[PDB]
Amino acid sequence: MDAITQVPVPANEPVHDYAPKSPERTRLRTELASLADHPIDLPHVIGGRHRMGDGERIDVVQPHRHAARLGTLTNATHADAAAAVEAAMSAKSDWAALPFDERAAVFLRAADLLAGPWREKIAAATMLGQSKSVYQAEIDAVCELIDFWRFNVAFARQILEQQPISGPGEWNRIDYRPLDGFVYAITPFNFTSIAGNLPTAPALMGNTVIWKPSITQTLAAYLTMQLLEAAGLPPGVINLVTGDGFAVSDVALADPRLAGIHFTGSTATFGHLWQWVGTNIGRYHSYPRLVGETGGKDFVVAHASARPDVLRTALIRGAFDYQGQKCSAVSRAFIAHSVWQRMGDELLAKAAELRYGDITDLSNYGGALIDQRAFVKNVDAIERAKGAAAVTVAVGGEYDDSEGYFVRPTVLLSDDPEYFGPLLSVHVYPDERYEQILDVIDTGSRYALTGAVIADDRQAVLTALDRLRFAAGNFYVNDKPTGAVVGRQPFGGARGSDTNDKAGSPLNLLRWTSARSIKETFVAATDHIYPHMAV
Amino acid sequence: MDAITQVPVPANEPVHDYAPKSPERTRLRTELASLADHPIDLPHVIGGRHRMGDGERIDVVQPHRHAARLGTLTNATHADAAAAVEAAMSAKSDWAALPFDERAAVFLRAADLLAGPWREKIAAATMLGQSKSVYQAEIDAVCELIDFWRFNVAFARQILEQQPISGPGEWNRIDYRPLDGFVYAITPFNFTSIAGNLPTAPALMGNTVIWKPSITQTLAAYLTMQLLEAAGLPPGVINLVTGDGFAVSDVALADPRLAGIHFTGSTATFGHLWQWVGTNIGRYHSYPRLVGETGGKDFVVAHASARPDVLRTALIRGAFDYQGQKCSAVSRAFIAHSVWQRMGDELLAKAAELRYGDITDLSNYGGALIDQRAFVKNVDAIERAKGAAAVTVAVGGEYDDSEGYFVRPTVLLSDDPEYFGPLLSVHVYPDERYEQILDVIDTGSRYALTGAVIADDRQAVLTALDRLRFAAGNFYVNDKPTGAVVGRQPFGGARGSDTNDKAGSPLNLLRWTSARSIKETFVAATDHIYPHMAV
Numbered sequence A, B: 001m002d003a004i005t006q007v008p009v010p011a012n013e014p015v016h017d018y019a020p021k022s023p024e025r026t027r028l029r030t031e032l033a034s035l036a037d038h039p040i041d042l043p044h045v046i047g048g049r050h051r052m053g054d055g056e057r058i059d060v061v062q063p064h065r066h067a068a069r070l071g072t073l074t075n076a077t078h079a080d081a082a083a084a085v086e087a088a089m090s091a092k093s094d095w096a097a098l099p100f101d102e103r104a105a106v107f108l109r110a111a112d113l114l115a116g117p118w119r120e121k122i123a124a125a126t127m128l129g130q131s132k133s134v135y136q137a138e139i140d141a142v143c144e145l146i147d148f149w150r151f152n153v154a155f156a157r158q159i160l161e162q163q164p165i166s167g168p169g170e171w172n173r174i175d176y177r178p179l180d181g182f183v184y185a186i187t188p189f190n191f192t193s194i195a196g197n198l199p200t201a202p203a204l205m206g207n208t209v210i211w212k213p214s215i216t217q218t219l220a221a222y223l224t225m226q227l228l229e230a231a232g233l234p235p236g237v238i239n240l241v242t243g244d245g246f247a248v249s250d251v252a253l254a255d256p257r258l259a260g261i262h263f264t265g266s267t268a269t270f271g272h273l274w275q276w277v278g279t280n281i282g283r284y285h286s287y288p289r290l291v292g293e294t295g296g297k298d299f300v301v302a303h304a305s306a307r308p309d310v311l312r313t314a315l316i317r318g319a320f321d322y323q324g325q326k327c328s329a330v331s332r333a334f335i336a337h338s339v340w341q342r343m344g345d346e347l348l349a350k351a352a353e354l355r356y357g358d359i360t361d362l363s364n365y366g367g368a369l370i371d372q373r374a375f376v377k378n379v380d381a382i383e384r385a386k387g388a389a390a391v392t393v394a395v396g397g398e399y400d401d402s403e404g405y406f407v408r409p410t411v412l413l414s415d416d417p418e419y420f421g422p423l424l425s426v427h428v429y430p431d432e433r434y435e436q437i438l439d440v441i442d443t444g445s446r447y448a449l450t451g452a453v454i455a456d457d458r459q460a461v462l463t464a465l466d467r468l469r470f471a472a473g474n475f476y477v478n479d480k481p482t483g484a485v486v487g488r489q490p491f492g493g494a495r496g497s498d499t500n501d502k503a504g505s506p507l508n509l510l511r512w513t514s515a516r517s518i519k520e521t522f523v524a525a526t527d528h529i530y531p532h533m534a535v
């Protein structure tokens, strides 16, 4: 090869609507029936070998219909974990020695497979196992994962061409090496996109990986692994180990070849892994790159100039999309009294009518909560709210785990200015207290990933962007604060977090490299003496 | 202001030679006499106030003439440290609210002051206190610090214009916020450039800082502080606390407002601070950004095709420049027998004749070791080498701490393939064992920051760049592996370190920011129902 090649130019994948009579709806139904009617083994995928292991068998079910099994996995044992580590270390040399363009082709090809023949399958599997409506499955499992692959390939190519100045007499270049060691990718239930990206991002840059997906996302994960295999991912570059991950960590965090951890999920899990790696820091051949994101909860503030209709829709969608189970969901709204008079009743009537049920009925707005643990935490939050003097349940609050893990959309009214679920707290404040409410938000916020202001008044908007500059990761104007699209709304971690390097920009990819400068001098000095030293 | 402004285009500052009869030599002598003859108090500089504190008095002396005092500082006490923290937190709001261009002007103006009227003063102070020849002082205290300022301003401006895609219906922008909290900058004796950059880099991006320079670099540091003040640095943006730093850390690492640490120095100090911050992680308002570099030792491998003259000069300069006291110095050479026959005697004769003495005599090649601790470690390394069967002292080895901390350039011959000082170990290997020697280097290297191959044969060069890809940070061809120039040879940390973000590229600056996306949607949805849900 004698070339300076360019990659295809990425653009965001269009979101299909699955409207009645559309051909994608019909294709989705065929995939929904096929996955739901033929449950499978969900094995470990180690050095290209699909194998059930010897650890306990654990079923993956439809959260919205928990009697209906989708598959059964086995809990990784220590020997499984040790096999995944050795297979990653064994694939490394032939993977790192493939040219970037051939590595990139794998992910570009996976993107195009996901965009086309696998589209409704990966969407259906995400709908079924994670309890997502077709819209939620589409923006995540299809569009966001496709965009991660195409955009990462573009970002990587952009990194490779960042090169230094050459002075007279020399040539300086930079080589973006992979890491020495394996990468451990641990992924959450709630996004099939994040589950795919976490292991493939470091892989693109020449690394090999063990991937520990969430149990309740393991159907879409296994199918993501199969898609990558059909795209030409070589055996052992990414190794999938199923289960709770406890035995995987026992092995991986003890191995001196651990190069880094790529994690998204709860702050409790992050802290544990973080303290563990710190406790063991003396064993590692290299300082492990810890790249992680943890949760928060989002807020909306509506100014007296807010459009009522926009506000109501941003609260319903922001709080209740995916049953409030995104990275963050709208949990706290601060609404000016005069705007509350115009849209308060409608917000409550619409929340009352919103349909949660079986997501194979495309009527429904959404599905169930992810598992019995989530359902219990939501029951407890609701009962705490019923008993707290400072909060009234204005609508919702009902729950029933008999057919699925269902919690109704719930709105709490609070007169005073955790869990993940469809619970929205609304405080109504006097219009003239806008600035004082901004201060409350600023003083009490450590865990907002995104905030929003709803206001037509430019001065009110700029006042929010200024005063709340540090009170939230990302910040939205006149829209819901959820649903970052790749290439468009990067970053967005919690306050005080160190998250410039999260998924969605070139900075994540640089975490999976170790850059080196190469300097060549054409005519170097042949006498050591310097001009100052002369008589 | 209604503008999209650009910054001046940076280029590397030219290095003055200080040759006999040059006007810069004459200006340097005036500055050398003035600093040497009028020793000063070296106070703390807190919220713009220069004050001696109540901790013990510690003299700063000429390492090469340790009876000659340059100044006297006081060991920061706890109350001093607490005052530096409060003054930083108190300057923050007016500094963060200055527009980038006005912050940048401070550093561009400091650069131009250092390039011109302060040039020979900051060079003289670095020569006197750190025992550097005029060449060593010039490439560091003047050129590298000037280039850090101008290049950082250019890199920062480049970061600010990295912006996302806007979709139809919206406008997405990115705001590069400063950190919330103060930055703690701890700097080493050996570079006046690093000492300046560490505190000013995060400052450029809107942060405020406490700076704890090395005792033996404190003359040039205090004068750097005065230069920044003459450039318009506002009071309390950077606060200088003198001494051993123990009492400064007691306060800073305990303060919940610690945003990050910017450190360069030994791995023992780094580990200690790192474990301390990890032990206290639960107290901090934000996860502290730990940005640090630690040492190593460098190697040169000469192929049978090496140019003898180039090799000899690269070994002398690489090992003996600044008495071997740079970030890394050439400590191990692997030389093909046939090339050793051609330049071995000359290398030994030239090392024997090389002059180390008082650096005010511009004849000398260099000066003394930095302090009594460095001198003792070098005495011990030499005596260990005299007693080890595997090594012969071929030249040098003599030392005398009576007038200054002087250690002679020393070459050890080793038949088998720590401290910082002028000690070079040479192993001579059979020409045909090139590839086997590359393997030895690779297997035994954890602490090489830079390596070099000396070879005219292209195949031998490519074999070294390939086999030693992971055995060294940066890698040099046909030159000494020391003296990275800003914008030209970035990166260059030790093996397994996490140092993409070190001084010398835009990645260091991003460590001092927290990026946020702002999304505005012009016509957001006014109904929550999705197209899939339709009858």
Ligand SMILES: NC(=O)c1ccc[n+]([C@@H]2O[C@H](COP(=O)([O-])OP(=O)(O)OC[C@H]3O[C@@H](n4cnc5c(N)ncnc54)[C@H](O)[C@@H]3O)[C@@H](O)[C@H]2O)c1
Pocket (backbone or CB within 6 Å): A186, A187, A188, A189, A190, A191, A194, A212, A213, A214, A215, A243, A244, A245, A246, A248, A249, A264, A265, A266, A267, A268, A269, A270, A272, A293, A294, A295, A296, A326, A327, A328, A420, A493
């Ligand atoms: N900030 C973001 O972008 C973002 C995105 C998605 C989810 N989240 C957050 O994550 C949580 C959502 O999902 P979750 O419940 O899957 O989080 P979780 O922490 O319970 O689980 C995350 C993953 O870690 C695994 N795990 C847990 N302990 C482990 C161990 N010791 N060793 C190995 N693996 C282990 C789990 O099986 C799962 O695969 C919420 O708090 C949410 O806010 C954040």
Ligand SMILES: NC(=O)c1ccc[n+]([C@@H]2O[C@H](COP(=O)([O-])OP(=O)(O)OC[C@H]3O[C@@H](n4cnc5c(N)ncnc54)[C@H](O)[C@@H]3O)[C@@H](O)[C@H]2O)c1
Pocket (backbone or CB within 6 Å): B186, B187, B188, B189, B190, B191, B194, B212, B213, B214, B215, B243, B244, B245, B246, B248, B249, B264, B265, B266, B267, B268, B269, B270, B272, B293, B294, B295, B296, B326, B327, B328, B420, B493
């Ligand atoms: N990698 C690089 O780019 C690079 C560059 C320069 C120096 N270095 C390394 O650093 C060392 C050189 O210099 P050094 O001797 O000044 O290193 P050092 O670690 O002894 O001291 C570094 C700084 O930390 C301070 N310090 C030490 N303990 C402290 C504490 N507990 N709290 C606060 N401050 C504390 C010292 O006074 C000094 O200012 C060598 O090992 C060298 O390789 C590395």
